[PDB]
Every structure is written in structure tokens, then in C-alpha cells.
Design a protein around this ligand. Structure first.
Ligand SMILES: CCCCCCCC/C=C\CCCCCCCC(=O)O
Ligand SMILES: CCCCCCCCCCCCCCCC(=O)O
Length: 157
């Protein structure tokens, strides 16, 4: 589902990529080879969101931006990889955590599913990890595919 009464303005700003579950071994392995710093959520010129991710790969800071186009329900977006993917904010309290769920909506990407835990703080919090694990299990992810991403304190400004 999608967060009821979703308020995009309260969702903006700095988030940390704390947890990930995916059914793609290729994707999990790619993510495991890097360390996340922060992500920034900001309104895009198209009415959706820009998600700008900063991370460390081989001790170099890198940034990548993804355009999340509005998908016609608040909290629901579409991403086209330069397959198309639905991206939903399933649950958030805005000031501590957000649970996102993505899956392919067109093309061979339809095989793809991913849950993401974002946190307003970088430091792990057991209750948030439990919430994420419960969500991933409910969405059919196996335990072994529910992982908590290595963080970095670099790249932060
Ligand atoms: C601009 C191309 C996509 C970059 C995505 C940026 C957010 C994640 C940062 C780098 C992780 C690299 C993993 C390769 C793409 C995975 C995309 C994803 O499923 O989140
Ligand atoms: C931010 C959500 C959108 C996701 C951005 C790209 C993620 C798709 C990567 C696909 C990798 C594997 C291809 C799908 C087949 C599979 O499920 O194994």
C-alpha cells in the first residue's frame, strides 16, 4: 500500500539508507560494494521528487540522482532507468523513518522487487530494524535478503 494522507513537504530533506531487501542478487552485490553517506529528497521540476544519493565507492565520493515522477497517487512515483519501476512510500512518520517499496511495472524489470528503510539518523535503531524486518517478511523477502547497508561518515556536506 501507500502511506495514507502522504505529505510530500514533510518527506523532503536528508535521509540515510539504513536497510535494503531485494530479490536481485546482482543488485544486492552492487550495493554491498559501496558505503552510503546520505540521500537528499527534493521536489523535481516535474512535480515528483529528485532522490540524490551520495556514497563511497573505492574510497571516492560519488553522487547519483534519480527522478521519481509522480504516478498519480500521492506517495506513489515512477522511475525509468536510463524498464520502468513503481516506487511507493508505504509508511513514514516523516521525522524518524520511511519504508519504501519498489517493483518493476514495465519490461523485464517486473521480476524486480526492493524494500528500503530510510532513517533520519544514521545510527542504527533496533526498533526501526525490527519494523523493517517485519515489513520485508510480510512482503515475501527471505531473511537472508534483508540486509543493513554499510554506512560512511564521509561525503556529508
Ligand atoms: C543513476 C543510476 C542509478 C543510481 C542510483 C543511486 C542510488 C543508489 C546509489 C548507488 C548504488 C549503485 C547500485 C546500482 C543501481 C542500483 C539502483 C537501486 O536499485 O537503488
Ligand atoms: C529506486 C527503485 C527503482 C530501482 C532502480 C533499479 C533497480 C532495478 C535493478 C534490477 C536488477 C535485477 C533485474 C530484475 C530481475 C530480478 O528481479 O532479479
Amino acid at each position: 500500500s501507500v502511506q495514507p494522507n502522504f505529505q510530500q513537504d514533510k518527506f523532503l530533506g536528508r535521509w540515510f539508507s539504513a536497510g535494503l531487501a531485494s530479490n536481485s542478487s546482482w543488485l544486492r552485490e552492487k550495493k554491498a560494494a559501496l558505503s552510503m553517506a546520505k540521500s537528499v529528497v527534493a521536489p523535481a521540476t516535474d512535480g515528483g521528487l529528485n532522490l540524490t544519493s551520495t556514497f563511497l565507492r573505492k574510497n571516492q565520493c560519488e553522487t547519483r540522482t534519480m527522478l521519481l515522477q509522480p504516478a498519480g497517487s500521492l506517495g506513489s512515483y515512477s522511475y525509468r532507468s536510463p524498464s520502468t519501476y513503481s516506487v511507493s512510500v508505504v509508511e513514514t512518520d516523516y521525522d524518524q523513518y520511511a519504508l519504501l517499496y519498489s517493483q518493476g511495472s514495465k519490461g523485464p524489470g517486473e521480476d524486480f522487487r526492493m524494500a528500503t528503510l530510510y532513517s533520519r539518523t544514521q545510527t542504527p535503531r533496533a526498533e526501526l530494524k525490527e519494523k523493517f524486518t517485519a515489513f520485508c517478511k510480510a512482503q515475501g523477502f527471505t531473511e537472508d535478503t534483508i540486509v543493513f547497508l554499510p554506512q560512511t561518515d564521509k561525503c556529508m556536506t
